[PDB]
Amino acid sequence: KAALREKLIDLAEAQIEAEGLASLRARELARQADCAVGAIYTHFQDLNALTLEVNGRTFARLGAAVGDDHPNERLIAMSHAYLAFAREHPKLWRALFDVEMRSDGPVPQWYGHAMAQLFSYITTPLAKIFPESDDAELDLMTRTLFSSVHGIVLLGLENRISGVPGEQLKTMIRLLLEQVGR
Amino acid sequence: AALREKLIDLAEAQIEAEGLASLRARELARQADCAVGAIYTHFQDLNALTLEVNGRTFARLGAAVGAVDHPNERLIAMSHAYLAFAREHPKLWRALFDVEMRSDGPVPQWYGHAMAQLFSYITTPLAKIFPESDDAELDLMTRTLFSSVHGIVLLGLENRISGVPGEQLKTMIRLLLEQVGR
Numbered sequence A: 001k002a003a004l005r006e007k008l009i010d011l012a013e014a015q016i017e018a019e020g021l022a023s024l025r026a027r028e029l030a031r032q033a034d035c036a037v038g039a040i041y042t043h044f045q046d047l048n049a050l051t052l053e054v055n056g057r058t059f060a061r062l063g064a065a066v067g068d069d070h071p072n073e074r075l076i077a078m079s080h081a082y083l084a085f086a087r088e089h090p091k092l093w094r095a096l097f098d099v100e101m102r103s104d105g106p107v108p109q110w111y112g113h114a115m116a117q118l119f120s121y122i123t124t125p126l127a128k129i130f131p132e133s134d135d136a137e138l139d140l141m142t143r144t145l146f147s148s149v150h151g152i153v154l155l156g157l158e159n160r161i162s163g164v165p166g167e168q169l170k171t172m173i174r175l176l177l178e179q180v181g182r
Numbered sequence B: 001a002a003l004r005e006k007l008i009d010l011a012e013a014q015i016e017a018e019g020l021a022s023l024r025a026r027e028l029a030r031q032a033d034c035a036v037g038a039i040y041t042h043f044q045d046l047n048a049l050t051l052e053v054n055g056r057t058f059a060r061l062g063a064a065v066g067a068v069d070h071p072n073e074r075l076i077a078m079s080h081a082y083l084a085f086a087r088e089h090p091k092l093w094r095a096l097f098d099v100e101m102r103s104d105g106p107v108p109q110w111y112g113h114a115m116a117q118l119f120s121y122i123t124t125p126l127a128k129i130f131p132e133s134d135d136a137e138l139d140l141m142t143r144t145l146f147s148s149v150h151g152i153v154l155l156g157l158e159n160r161i162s163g164v165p166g167e168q169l170k171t172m173i174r175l176l177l178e179q180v181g182r
Ligand SMILES: CCCCCCCCCCCCCCCCCC(=O)O
Pocket: A160, A161, A162, A163, B061, B065, B075, B076, B078, B079, B082, B096, B097, B101, B115, B118, B119, B121, B122, B145, B146, B149
């Protein structure tokens, strides 16, 4: 059970990496794990729940990637690591945004904490840039700038006709963030 | 002439009712009272019919953005119009980003030109804000800010745990855009 639970998370991560989030099937994972398909449902409520565990690991990788007198430079460096991550782990990266997870519904504490912890890396330099801003103001700015970088990265990496060209993604993130708070 | 236009009218109605993923040649042909082959006679594939519907969505966007020296306020107003559109026409809005369309592959000239015409509305105030920037620099900044607003709207409307809250989307679009031109 302890071994099986871990083995299923390992295999789920492997599948997402190979063929994407949409390719994950209970029959196939059970076959790879050498268990009954119902053994998957003994450890996770559904495939979405198993995907959240994979996303837990993806957050950990992102947190390692992200990690003081130049706060705009810190924001840029972190954004460049986000871009590099998205490029390096495209399918795991897309699973973070494609899994069923909403601010409306129940967010599990471990999951909500991991995401809150990533956001604190962005809020630190923003507090230096905006010394007069309160926590609500800082939280809103963190969400705005993160959402902005994600948009640049999403449209650019998808090669959409509206996005910034691939070769200019790093440069354009810099140019956007340099302007933040003068 | 009647059937080509009727197929576009019907494809738009289907996308609005059930989303891009629900679009089928068999069902469209049934509604239009034609054979499935009559669809492929007017459009190479469903992708091509989807581009025609997206063409109408661009025209909807163009009308909303054109409505009536404060270029930062113009960017904010246009961005607010983009937010409103995304909330009001969520399925047609998603079809613009979900259709198979890359800058690597063939982009039909009429389609690229229509999207470029929308971008010219953003570039005009950007040229006032950044008078020292050349055309290349302005196009990259147009792409960067569009992508930033889109990220804000996308993660906000999807109620993602990393997004700016629904009730705060307009405010954060304002707080992002006022910082442009530092
Ligand atoms: C910073 C100002 C942003 C203002 C946005 C509103 C202005 C006009 C609309 C421009 C966006 C058109 C939609 C582009 C859709 C792209 C779909 C794709 O890349 O395939």
